[PDB]
Amino acid sequence: RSKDLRHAFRSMFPSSE
């Protein structure tokens, strides 16, 4: 699951909160 690291890019946005 090395491709799962791409899911962290979504946490960089304000929509993560």
Residue 8 and residue 14 in contact, taking contact as beta carbons nearer than 8 Å: no
State the method: NMR
Q: Which two tokens stand for residue 9?
A: 């890019």
CA angle 17, 9, 16 (to 5 degrees): 5
Percent helix, percent strand, percent coil in the chain, to nearest 5: 70, 0, 30
- Left if phi > 0, otherwise alpha if psi is -120 to 50, otherwise beta: which for 9? alpha
Q: Which two tokens stand for residue 8?
A: 């962290």
Q: Which two tokens stand for residue 11?
A: 């946490």
DSSP states along the chain: -GGGGGGGGGTTSGGG-
In angstroms, the CA 1 to CA 11 distance is 18
